[PDB]
Design a protein around this motif. Structure first.
Motif, PDB file in Angstrom:
ATOM      1  N   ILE B 173       0.828  -1.200   0.000  1.00  0.00           N
ATOM      2  CA  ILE B 173       0.000   0.000   0.000  1.00  0.00           C
ATOM      3  C   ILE B 173       0.863   1.250   0.000  1.00  0.00           C
ATOM      4  O   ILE B 173       0.552   2.234  -0.685  1.00  0.00           O
ATOM      5  CB  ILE B 173      -0.960  -0.016   1.206  1.00  0.00           C
ATOM      6  CG1 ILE B 173      -2.117  -0.982   0.964  1.00  0.00           C
ATOM      7  CG2 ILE B 173      -1.464   1.389   1.518  1.00  0.00           C
ATOM      8  CD1 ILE B 173      -3.096  -0.994   2.098  1.00  0.00           C
ATOM      9  N   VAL B 174       1.946   1.237   0.773  1.00  0.00           N
ATOM     10  CA  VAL B 174       2.794   2.408   0.980  1.00  0.00           C
ATOM     11  C   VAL B 174       4.213   1.937   1.245  1.00  0.00           C
ATOM     12  O   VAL B 174       4.429   1.000   2.014  1.00  0.00           O
ATOM     13  CB  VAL B 174       2.281   3.269   2.151  1.00  0.00           C
ATOM     14  CG1 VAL B 174       3.360   4.244   2.632  1.00  0.00           C
ATOM     15  CG2 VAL B 174       1.051   4.003   1.727  1.00  0.00           C
TER      16      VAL B 174
ATOM     17  N   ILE C  32      -7.422  15.002   5.435  1.00  0.00           N
ATOM     18  CA  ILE C  32      -6.382  14.788   4.438  1.00  0.00           C
ATOM     19  C   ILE C  32      -5.968  16.115   3.811  1.00  0.00           C
ATOM     20  O   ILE C  32      -6.766  17.054   3.671  1.00  0.00           O
ATOM     21  CB  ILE C  32      -6.829  13.773   3.365  1.00  0.00           C
ATOM     22  CG1 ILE C  32      -7.680  14.439   2.277  1.00  0.00           C
ATOM     23  CG2 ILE C  32      -7.577  12.610   4.006  1.00  0.00           C
ATOM     24  CD1 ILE C  32      -8.133  13.481   1.183  1.00  0.00           C
ATOM     25  N   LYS C 336       1.908  19.079   5.688  1.00  0.00           N
ATOM     26  CA  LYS C 336       1.238  18.334   6.751  1.00  0.00           C
ATOM     27  C   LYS C 336       1.414  19.009   8.108  1.00  0.00           C
ATOM     28  O   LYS C 336       0.434  19.252   8.820  1.00  0.00           O
ATOM     29  CB  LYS C 336       1.782  16.901   6.792  1.00  0.00           C
ATOM     30  CG  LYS C 336       0.717  15.828   6.934  1.00  0.00           C
ATOM     31  CD  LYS C 336      -0.077  15.654   5.647  1.00  0.00           C
ATOM     32  CE  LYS C 336      -1.402  14.960   5.914  1.00  0.00           C
ATOM     33  NZ  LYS C 336      -2.210  15.686   6.933  1.00  0.00           N
TER      34      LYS C 336
ATOM     35  N   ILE D  25      -0.891   9.390   0.609  1.00  0.00           N
ATOM     36  CA  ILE D  25      -2.186   8.719   0.699  1.00  0.00           C
ATOM     37  C   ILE D  25      -2.204   7.732   1.861  1.00  0.00           C
ATOM     38  O   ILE D  25      -3.223   7.572   2.543  1.00  0.00           O
ATOM     39  CB  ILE D  25      -2.520   8.031  -0.641  1.00  0.00           C
ATOM     40  CG1 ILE D  25      -3.061   9.041  -1.660  1.00  0.00           C
ATOM     41  CG2 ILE D  25      -3.495   6.873  -0.447  1.00  0.00           C
ATOM     42  CD1 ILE D  25      -3.174   8.470  -3.082  1.00  0.00           C
ATOM     43  N   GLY D  26      -1.081   7.069   2.118  1.00  0.00           N
ATOM     44  CA  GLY D  26      -1.042   6.062   3.160  1.00  0.00           C
ATOM     45  C   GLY D  26      -0.887   6.617   4.557  1.00  0.00           C
ATOM     46  O   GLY D  26      -1.442   6.063   5.514  1.00  0.00           O
ATOM     47  N   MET D  27      -0.124   7.709   4.687  1.00  0.00           N
ATOM     48  CA  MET D  27      -0.125   8.471   5.930  1.00  0.00           C
ATOM     49  C   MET D  27      -1.539   8.894   6.310  1.00  0.00           C
ATOM     50  O   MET D  27      -1.856   9.026   7.497  1.00  0.00           O
ATOM     51  CB  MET D  27       0.790   9.695   5.795  1.00  0.00           C
ATOM     52  CG  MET D  27       2.274   9.405   5.987  1.00  0.00           C
ATOM     53  SD  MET D  27       2.624   8.721   7.621  1.00  0.00           S
ATOM     54  CE  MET D  27       1.863   9.945   8.691  1.00  0.00           C
ATOM     55  N   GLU D  28      -2.402   9.095   5.317  1.00  0.00           N
ATOM     56  CA  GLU D  28      -3.805   9.371   5.585  1.00  0.00           C
ATOM     57  C   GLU D  28      -4.591   8.087   5.833  1.00  0.00           C
ATOM     58  O   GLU D  28      -5.484   8.062   6.686  1.00  0.00           O
ATOM     59  CB  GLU D  28      -4.410  10.147   4.415  1.00  0.00           C
ATOM     60  CG  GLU D  28      -3.817  11.526   4.205  1.00  0.00           C
ATOM     61  CD  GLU D  28      -3.933  11.999   2.767  1.00  0.00           C
ATOM     62  OE1 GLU D  28      -4.398  11.214   1.909  1.00  0.00           O
ATOM     63  OE2 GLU D  28      -3.553  13.161   2.501  1.00  0.00           O
ATOM     64  N   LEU D  29      -4.267   7.014   5.107  1.00  0.00           N
ATOM     65  CA  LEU D  29      -5.101   5.815   5.132  1.00  0.00           C
ATOM     66  C   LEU D  29      -4.960   5.063   6.451  1.00  0.00           C
ATOM     67  O   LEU D  29      -5.961   4.730   7.094  1.00  0.00           O
ATOM     68  CB  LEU D  29      -4.748   4.906   3.952  1.00  0.00           C
ATOM     69  CG  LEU D  29      -5.488   3.566   3.898  1.00  0.00           C
ATOM     70  CD1 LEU D  29      -6.974   3.755   3.603  1.00  0.00           C
ATOM     71  CD2 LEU D  29      -4.839   2.629   2.879  1.00  0.00           C
ATOM     72  N   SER D  30      -3.723   4.764   6.862  1.00  0.00           N
ATOM     73  CA  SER D  30      -3.527   4.053   8.120  1.00  0.00           C
ATOM     74  C   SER D  30      -4.010   4.863   9.318  1.00  0.00           C
ATOM     75  O   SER D  30      -4.310   4.276  10.364  1.00  0.00           O
ATOM     76  CB  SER D  30      -2.054   3.675   8.296  1.00  0.00           C
ATOM     77  OG  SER D  30      -1.632   2.769   7.288  1.00  0.00           O
ATOM     78  N   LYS D  31      -4.090   6.194   9.189  1.00  0.00           N
ATOM     79  CA  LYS D  31      -4.712   7.016  10.225  1.00  0.00           C
ATOM     80  C   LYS D  31      -6.123   6.542  10.538  1.00  0.00           C
ATOM     81  O   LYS D  31      -6.525   6.485  11.708  1.00  0.00           O
ATOM     82  CB  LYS D  31      -4.763   8.487   9.794  1.00  0.00           C
ATOM     83  CG  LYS D  31      -3.548   9.326  10.146  1.00  0.00           C
ATOM     84  CD  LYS D  31      -3.839  10.816   9.941  1.00  0.00           C
ATOM     85  CE  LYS D  31      -2.558  11.623   9.705  1.00  0.00           C
ATOM     86  NZ  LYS D  31      -1.530  11.448  10.778  1.00  0.00           N
TER      87      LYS D  31
END
Ligand SMILES: CCCCC/C=C\C/C=C/C/C=C/C/C=C/CCCC(=O)O[C@@H](COC(=O)CCCCCCCCCCCCCCCCC)COP(=O)(O)O[C@@H]1[C@H](O)[C@H](O)[C@H](OP(=O)(O)O)[C@@H](OP(=O)(O)O)[C@H]1O
Ligand SMILES: CCCCC/C=C\C/C=C/C/C=C/C/C=C/CCCC(=O)O[C@@H](COC(=O)CCCCCCCCCCCCCCCCC)COP(=O)(O)O[C@@H]1[C@H](O)[C@H](O)[C@H](OP(=O)(O)O)[C@@H](OP(=O)(O)O)[C@H]1O
Ligand SMILES: CCCCC/C=C\C/C=C/C/C=C/C/C=C/CCCC(=O)O[C@@H](COC(=O)CCCCCCCCCCCCCCCCC)COP(=O)(O)O[C@@H]1[C@H](O)[C@H](O)[C@H](OP(=O)(O)O)[C@@H](OP(=O)(O)O)[C@H]1O
Ligand SMILES: CCCCC/C=C\C/C=C/C/C=C/C/C=C/CCCC(=O)O[C@@H](COC(=O)CCCCCCCCCCCCCCCCC)COP(=O)(O)O[C@@H]1[C@H](O)[C@H](O)[C@H](OP(=O)(O)O)[C@@H](OP(=O)(O)O)[C@H]1O
Lengths: 372, 372, 392, 392
Positions: B173-174, C32, C336, D25-31
């Motif tokens: 994913i990342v 976001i 951020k 996007i992932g810093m946002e998603l795993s949040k």
């Protein structure tokens, strides 16, 4: 036998993702946009009143009162009306409020809805078209009814043109959906030179309408205030200036009060008593109305019946048959013909406008679009 | 004329959203999964060595060395191989490493790939099938090659069965995608009763393989350690116990070292020198190989050529023709026939297994599946 | 030991369940940040100053005694003020509440001070003065962004005010809208359109500038057509051209006689007089986020500035610095960071219930059109800065 | 004044741009938090204790002197320990690092203490003792969740250990996997499958329990089939049934002679002996998140507990309380709050570089299978709690 030590091309945009990766009826109300447009007529008594008055200043009050009223049923009507198919018509005759109104969906790209209204006693004509231009503004969607609205007071040899304010739906992404209406609205009386300004103030002053009436000379003749959810008032400008439910300034005059939504309302999509009649049918009306009336539209029909699953299946069908119908005219070189409105100069502004073609209330319908 | 004061049904799930709302080739490498399966053969010299040895303990070392090697080319091979079409074959003859290997995609739901390998001097057969069962595990995808792997050492009247460890792709994913391989692997020599245990330790001990060899009596006879990215070693168990690149325990024996990837590598999808030959063609080979060989597969072809746009268009085409081919057999009552593998008992475990049907290297191909 | 939970489980079949899916998804969504990757190393406060690039036109008008001839120079300035927009598909950084930007040019004869004066809505107030004491250019910009289809609109809500001090006269106008076509899907291109009225409040002179939209086949792209008329509505000039390149002026009567897409050539009506021509971008341009030379100066810093300018100045903004230094990887982390420091400051001011104070601007009516506006509070060029907010 | 930015703009055509889209996007998603709306008012530490519901079987085995007859009771306990799973499609709350749960039942003859002993991976350690000093049930559960298609798997990684103190003998097994079918799309249903081996480390007795999977047409749903064999691999019992309902036992030789979906009836092989039967759920059940009566006791509290139990006990967990009280609207806000307090505690412990200390469990080998396990550190039933972590 010797083999290759490298690949031909070394290893190495949204297109791939786009090529290789409708609206839910649960968000509609059971109304065609054409029907939602006939709620303009909910207070046609103000038009009839206007027509019986000698002083054009008094007449401009009732038209100003009427213009506010035609966009007043929209509070808490957070259900989107069904986008009308190309060729969809809609008629409404009300014997008490004294009008007939035919509307036809003229184009689909963009969506333009044309309407023609006549007082039954031949005291007025009310007509125009509406394109509701949708724009996602932040956390809200704006709908903007693009198009001029023309009201002719036939006993007075005059015509008023104006346009409607913007209808904004807040919290569309998150929170309780709710309706705001803002914008400025000029009403020009083209015979007298009279102008009426209606500001629909944006939010505190929620739903606040403020404005004035002035002669061609530009002398203010009264102020106009209230809320499009409730009522409009006229008052002497000099005392309105000094003095800034609703705040009743001394010596004001009630120009209009919103018609009645039934206690049943919030169970019926917040429809008004006027709105509750729009999509009704019966065996009599079936013989007379054309095959394009949205009273014969299955998905609005089935949704009004609660059959929401059958409504979303039926909705996607018409939209698909409508694309398919577009692509056959895209090839067969045929182009669409509007049964009841043709395009022409608005004489009071010289701006293109849709114009009623006549002959609708004669019936004897012939070769109508098969859009269901 | 009296109108209705209420709607028939009062106003009032994922189905509507589902009904009314592929993989990007930019994530593949230019290899069929069948071809990625032939990298098992990259170190077939260990098999040939095994076959020339008298002591089965020494023989189990080379098979253990070989089993580690067959999953060793996967470090930094973060490109997914193309899912093989139903009926896709793949052949590889290597005159130096001494083998031929036919594989055929047996089923597509689930995706099962069958392979048969033979030493050119008739010293071994290597066969089995692989279903790579994909599971999204957190922030990573697991691929698990379901299926037994059977290696028969023909000069020694023996057969070894085992299964492969799990292949995990982290940071999917990342972050920077990277490969881990973990799992325990038992190698049973079915004649001797000998067992070899290979733990592929999960991550510190990145890529760490540790294990042992024991007789049927359950006496350990050596330990086996190293990393599947580099090398395996045997050493006396007694001194391996006391003593816990790579840590070389005293008096250890190099069983295997990874074959050579070219300095060109990281520009060519991190392919090995073995992998760089897999998808090659030429005018000779065109006449002989069947129409199902994935050397004749346009999207892997075009991607290896850099034509990625043409690759993703060509990929979606085959997948679509493959659905369409499924739905015609879904109706026409025909069911798919595997040209080169039939299903049958694995005799060393009694577990269903795909079994080579013979006759492939005879050519004279007849009525082959038209899958491109 | 109890036989039931205090309350039954709440149902999925009832639609009461997805409005809490609604509540939780949006608390995540508005969190976001827009990726730095669609921005350009400019604060909107700096993008605002590019109006000033062609201030030489204000100086031209300051020294003309025919009012209409002054009008031809303000309209020239109005068209020129929005010219740098062409090919500017990077979105300047939304300025943090409290951000300022100052720009002093002596080669150009002006000094400008801007402040981000509110965060919802995002309103930028600016005030520029001529150094020869010959004009004040001041106003506010609220960029109302609107998405639909492939297009993003930014309507700059606000009145802009040129007061020509030596003529005791003042112009007001409102800028056109800026469309960005083919967001996500296709190549971005910029369009400006909207009717701009410029009014000389002393003389009653009206300039009409119609920034024409693309239309079908892309034929009217960037075209600007309008007139100048006196208080009794008689056309004295026609104006025309493209806002990317030039503005001409010509006898009105002869203009009537003549009545990713590429623009059309300007047909030069006989008797035209060029009022304004754009200075072409440097060859750096398409590589430099499509800046004009003027735009490339705005975020430039010396230690000689960092002492004089206040600490709020966006030349001291870290994410905009990171992005400009190529460290775009860091810039989205600096972005951020700053967008959360600002949330934390404002919620903190709610637990404390203190109202925020704009340092250099206050609210007040525009005496020219009655609109509510933003008005310089003074003292900015004194220096002697005190109690400024810590926003970085 | 500079003629260029310090570094050219970085390119979209080069694929270096989407890996920063990837990073942001992932810093946002795993949040984002999993919505409370798919949970059930139980901490996994509490869902873990439902193993204990049928402890009467351990007490049965404690007092039988035929080893295989004890095995038939441990297998009965193994099957029963996972029985409450049927129709439990709510996902128990992942317990916060530091969470405990204690449960004392005298009607059942056991006392249990669990601690969430790590957050990545999420490992729950538990230790239960018989009050008659007749067993220790202890082990750890790491629920490895795996999604694919419509299904979610939770593999409970861990060794579970029953030591029958009066027989100086110890059983170890590993539980089956729990599938949840038709997530999002369709009606959820629960399946358990996987081979469970139970070993009597004293006697060498092996129990094999194959929890059969659904298979085609749903025919083997919930079926459990296996045997008990001695150290030399001779079958002494067949066992069979469904893990939702019953476990039978029967002569092995006769069993060989007989060799959203609905389950099949259990065909009662002549000579069978019922070992275990489930107690049916109350009529509250389908309305009460499909709890069994036992499960409805776990989060119950009196002020008589809140003084005795430690503050970490999940009976004192607010989001699980909110959800149970019907205030699901609040529960996702309490959830939101707790998942960030826990992040903040652990990052804080990184700036300080201090290692986290489990209060009631430590690591150490399982002496029975050499696996690394979690072992009670004692002193929990002393009370005299000191320095416990603040996690609410
Ligand atoms: C060239 C000239 C440009 C043409 C401009 C057309 C704008 C769309 C007009 C439509 O009202 O706005 C669509 C937009 O939808 C949604 O997301 C809107 C999302 C936010 C909605 C806000 C909800 C709150 C509103 C409640 C109160 C507002 C009252 C007024 C609303 C009336 C608006 C019609 C409505 O929904 P919709 O039911 O009408 O769906 C159409 C339709 O289905 C048609 O059929 C198409 O075309 P076609 O494919 O059939 O040819 C489709 O797709 P596409 O072709 O445009 O790509 C598809 O957009
Ligand atoms: C009934 C029995 C169950 C059948 C189980 C099938 C599992 C899929 C096997 C496939 O390998 O995994 C799909 C899954 O995709 C993606 O998201 C995967 C996302 C994560 C991928 C991880 C990337 C890192 C991997 C790199 C290193 C790993 C090496 C090993 C990988 C080899 C795996 C094949 C691969 O991609 P794909 O190119 O093969 O796409 C298929 C295909 O296209 C087929 O065609 C279909 O069926 P059909 O529609 O043509 O009949 C499609 O759709 P559907 O029908 O299953 O719904 C579609 O899923
Ligand atoms: C009290 C009641 C308030 C009621 C609200 C109504 C009015 C609010 C106005 C703002 C709404 C904008 C939508 C969300 C978006 O993010 O706005 C962004 C826009 O990008 C969106 O993501 C894009 C979403 C996906 C699709 C569209 C992509 C657009 C690409 C841009 C192309 C380039 C155009 C350039 C042309 C020239 C421009 C003049 C502005 O760029 P931005 O990076 O600087 O972000 C600020 C700020 O920096 C801070 O983050 C805020 O607020 P907050 O975080 O402090 O609370 C933010 O959003 P929000 O919280 O208001 O929603 C945010 O606006
Ligand atoms: C250092 C290197 C580490 C490498 C990572 C590898 C291993 C990590 C293991 C966790 C990965 C799970 C995926 C993300 C997900 O969220 O996990 C959730 C799962 O729901 C997902 O959203 C679902 C996504 C959409 C689709 C699937 C829907 C599933 C529906 C469930 C059905 C019911 C099943 C019940 C059956 C019985 C169960 C025993 C657990 O429920 P949970 O609410 O309690 O959330 C915790 C925790 O509470 C804290 O939030 C964490 O960590 P953190 O936030 O403290 O950092 C969290 O995620 P993460 O950060 O690890 O990714 C989170 O796992």
């Amino acid at each position: 036998k010797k083999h290759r030590t490298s690949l031909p091309s070394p290893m190495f945009i949204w297109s791939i993702l786009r090529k290789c990766i409708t609206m839910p009826v649960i968000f509609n109300e059971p109304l065609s946009f054409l029907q939602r447009l006939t709620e303009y007529m909910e207070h046609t008594y103000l038009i009839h009143k206007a027509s019986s008055l000698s002083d054009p200043v008094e007449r401009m009050q009732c038209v100003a009162a009427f213009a506010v009223s035609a966009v007043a049923s929209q509070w808490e009507r957070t259900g989107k009306p069904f986008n009308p198919l190309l060729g969809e018509t809609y008629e409404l005759v009300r014997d008490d409020l004294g009008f007939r109104l035919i509307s036809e969906q003229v184009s689909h790209h963009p969506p333009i809805s044309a309407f023609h209204a006549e007082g039954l006693n031949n005291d007025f004509i009310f007509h125009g078209s509406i394109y509701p231009k949708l724009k996602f503004w932040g956390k809200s969607v704006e709908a903007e009814p693009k198009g001029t609205i023309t009201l002719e007071l036939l006993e007075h040899n005059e015509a008023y043109t104006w346009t409607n304010p913007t209808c904004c739906v807040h919290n569309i992404i998150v929170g309780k959906l709710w309706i705001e209406q803002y914008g400025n609205v000029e009403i020009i009386n083209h015979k007298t030179g009279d102008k009426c300004v209606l500001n629909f103030k944006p939010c505190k002053e929620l739903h606040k309408v403020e404005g004035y009436i002035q002669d061609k000379s530009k002398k203010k003749l009264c102020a106009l205030y209230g809320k499009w959810t409730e009522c409009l008032y006229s008052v002497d400008p000099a005392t309105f200036d000094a003095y800034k439910s609703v705040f009743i300034i001394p010596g004001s005059v009630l120009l209009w009060r919103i018609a009645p939504r039934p206690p049943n309302s919030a169970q019926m999509y917040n429809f008004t008593s006027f709105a509750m009649v729009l999509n009704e049918v019966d065996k009599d009306m079936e013989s007379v109305i054309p095959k394009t009336d949205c009273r014969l539209r299955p998905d609005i029909r089935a949704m009004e019946n609660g059959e929401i699953d059958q409504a979303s299946e039926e909705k996607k069908r018409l939209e698909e048959k409508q694309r398919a119908a577009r692509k056959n005219r895209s090839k067969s070189e045929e182009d669409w013909k509007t049964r009841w409105f043709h395009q022409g100069p608005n004489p009071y502004n010289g701006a293109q406008d849709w114009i009623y073609s006549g002959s609708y209330w004669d019936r004897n319908y012939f070769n109508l679009p098969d859009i269901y």
